[PDB]
Design a protein around this nucleic acid. Sequence first.
DNA 1: TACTGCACATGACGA
Length: 769
Amino acid sequence: MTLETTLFPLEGLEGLTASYQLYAVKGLSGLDETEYHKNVNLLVRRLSFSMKAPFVALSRDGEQFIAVPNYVTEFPVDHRVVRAMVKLVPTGEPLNLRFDAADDEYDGLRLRYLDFVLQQPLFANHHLWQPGSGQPFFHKKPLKRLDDVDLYDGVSVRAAKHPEGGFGIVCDARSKFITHTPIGARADRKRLGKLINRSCLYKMGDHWYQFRIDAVSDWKVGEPSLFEGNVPISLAQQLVRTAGNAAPKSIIDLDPEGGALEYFTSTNERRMAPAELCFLIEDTHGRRAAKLQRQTILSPSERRARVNGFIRRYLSELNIGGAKLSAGARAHAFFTETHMPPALSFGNGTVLAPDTSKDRFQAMQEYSSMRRTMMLDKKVGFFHQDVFPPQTLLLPESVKKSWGPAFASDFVGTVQELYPAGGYRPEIIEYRDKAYGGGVPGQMKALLEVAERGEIKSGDVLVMLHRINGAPRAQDKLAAMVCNEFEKRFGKRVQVIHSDSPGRGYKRIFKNDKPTYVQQRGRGVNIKGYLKGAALNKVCLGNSRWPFVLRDPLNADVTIGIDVKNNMAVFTMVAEGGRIVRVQRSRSRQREQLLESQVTQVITEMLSKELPEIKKQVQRVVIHRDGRAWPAEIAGARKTFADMAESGLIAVDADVSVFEVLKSSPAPLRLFSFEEPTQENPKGVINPVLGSWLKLSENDGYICTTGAPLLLQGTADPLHVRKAFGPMAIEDALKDVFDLSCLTWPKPDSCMRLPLTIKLCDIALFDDA
DNA sequence: TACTGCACATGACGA
């Protein structure tokens, strides 16, 4: 019940002052909406990098208004590219924002400035470095040596509004893996080729930063490759030129035969750097580094200790010109009531509700297990129990001629035991997976031709695919295309598994003087666990057979999730208690963004189909965006629902609100709860409990969709949700984000970080055109 | 097959 944050008070904020000079933009009256605000942002990016100053945008009224700092002087005021031509007229009267006053809309301006000048003392600390601007600050000394790769520890620092008034600082520990020894001067033109688009840390003497390799230079470090005023200069002469004073040996005694890399500046010029001073960033999310990744998951006491360490060590004194700032040593703490999980409804009128008499921790663990065993118990079971429509199972020819039939037999029997009301009985079909190519084209040609033959009766298909490319950072093209084409050209709803995981669960045995396949539990997969999880996720949830739903209404009558990536948008809708769930894909113009009209279209169409089934009149609507919410998207959303209030489809006085769900937060905040100190836990720091929550503002909040009883390792990552519009109190939004995340349908006995709405986007949009 | 925690990704530097 007692919680501590990673938000820290800022003392001495007075005197510190921010002076902007609002402008306004003329450009093109052609406010193409998605194309107007895209250009607003491009200029503020272009201007911030070029003039190295905190330019902000303030979109009130006409959405114009660029804030220029008052210490820059020769301001061009006109700016090319950007298609059309642009002019910035001032809006006069010079601003002088303050950190003691009260909530403005100029507080996005104070926050920009505050973040800009706080990274000035840290940037000039000889023992810290920063890969790039906005990123965390790392110790130059590795925390751990870890054999051929070094583990660096860092702490991110972000200005925030303080809930008890004023301004503070949110912080979080970070980790980074860098190879111990440099690329080297002894690395040839061909090996430096193999390294383009990798990233490396450049130890440019005392100045450390990170860049992305774009090219191998034609010139060695000692040959003339650039020139300062006509005179052709070598890169080695250039670095000696800009070394200062007691320059370290490494940057004034380079091997002249070593190679150089090339890379682009923030403002897009070309620059070189000697390979002798460059250390490859070990992309531990590119290559599977299981032993390494364990080192980056911190226990709550480890995580609190490193964040506070860094605050006490580097932030107790801060000289921003005149001002002398301090970060308080004690982070903001508070008493709160934690949200209890919601009552849920299963089969046979059975309800599951958290016991209020047990202590919270025991109550949460019993409830979360009960979600699984109630689902499995034949006398309670799924909330939605009917017979399945016809089902197809589509297998590679090479699998059907081997372990296929043993797998299918086990899989059906697993479905029948999980979901006995369904009578699962699929028709087993094959496609000629060895006939055309084994790459994405070829597999597709074999799959299509089976569909064109009409061999897929039934509208639901579970298709088993070969994994074309692995590495948990590529993208499953083949699975995406089979869903688009099987749904567009034919009317099919398709789920997907892969051939490798279940293959590893079968071995060939000789029985009754005949070869047959049977299970094995060697290593490669827990095959029994694989069948249960795939039966649930691919067949039951694939057929919209929800195993449990909310007993009691949320604050929103309907709530809608929206994500867009790779020119594929996904809308999802959750109404009644999860009793109504619709997931609808749709192609888009932009890669990650939606046209004002495409929003009004898809949503009116989805909601109108379901409104006859929603027996309470609709009067509170919530949209959950995955990422930033662009105002072309908010407009289409305000539009859609204004209409339906006139047509009488919903209540006349109904209202909408839009919220961003920032699964990767720009201000990562953590929460801690406390315990009896205990030898192994000297300070007694533990995870917060599952329902803990915190409001920093009327527009920013945090909710622990994961937490104490149900986390097996690490420290909980609270979920950041930000209001973008509407009459809905952020506390109310936080409460049903939490209720929506107790619908743990993919793994009932678990916590689940995202609410169901944007959780539905992830699995659906894993398949993007 | 599925769950979390993790590093991967808007906006200042630096050959």
